[PDB]
Amino acid sequence: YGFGSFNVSSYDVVYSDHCFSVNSDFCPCADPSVVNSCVKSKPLSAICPA
Amino acid sequence: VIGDFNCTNSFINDYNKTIPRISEDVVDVSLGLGTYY
Ligand SMILES: *[C@@H]1O[C@H](CO)[C@@H](O)[C@H](O)[C@H]1NC(C)=O
Numbered sequence: 001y002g003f004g005s006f007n008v009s010s011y012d013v014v015y016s017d018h019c020f021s022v023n024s025d026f027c028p029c030a031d032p033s034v035v036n037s038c039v040k041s042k043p044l045s046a047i048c049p050a
Numbered sequence: 051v052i053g054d055f056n057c058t059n060s061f062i063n064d065y066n067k068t069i070p071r072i073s074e075d076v077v078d079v080s081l082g083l084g085t086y087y
Pocket residue numbers: 007008009
């Protein structure tokens with residue numbers, strides 16, 4: 001789901017602080033066809049994989 | 051489904067509801083089945 005690179009200086013190492021595991025059917029986008037009646041809290045959307 | 055690369059679409063009977071009977075059996079370990087060295 002779109003991780004390109006670490007764009008930092010080439011002598012600094014990266015380390016995380018939280019690991020979030022998800023299930024095998026994850027997608028961070030909402031369904032766009034079920035948003036056409038909402039006014040408040042309209043999220044960005046796309047077409048998730050099958 | 052399994053993956054998300056559409057390989058082909060020939061002869062895909064996607065009009066059904068019947069999840070078929072699979073089978074059942076009982077695992078019997080009395081003679082060595084299910085063990086390893
Ligand atoms: C890497 O690129 C992003 C966007 O192009 C920018 O925000 C960031 O400051 C860059 N990092 C460095 C170390 O140049």
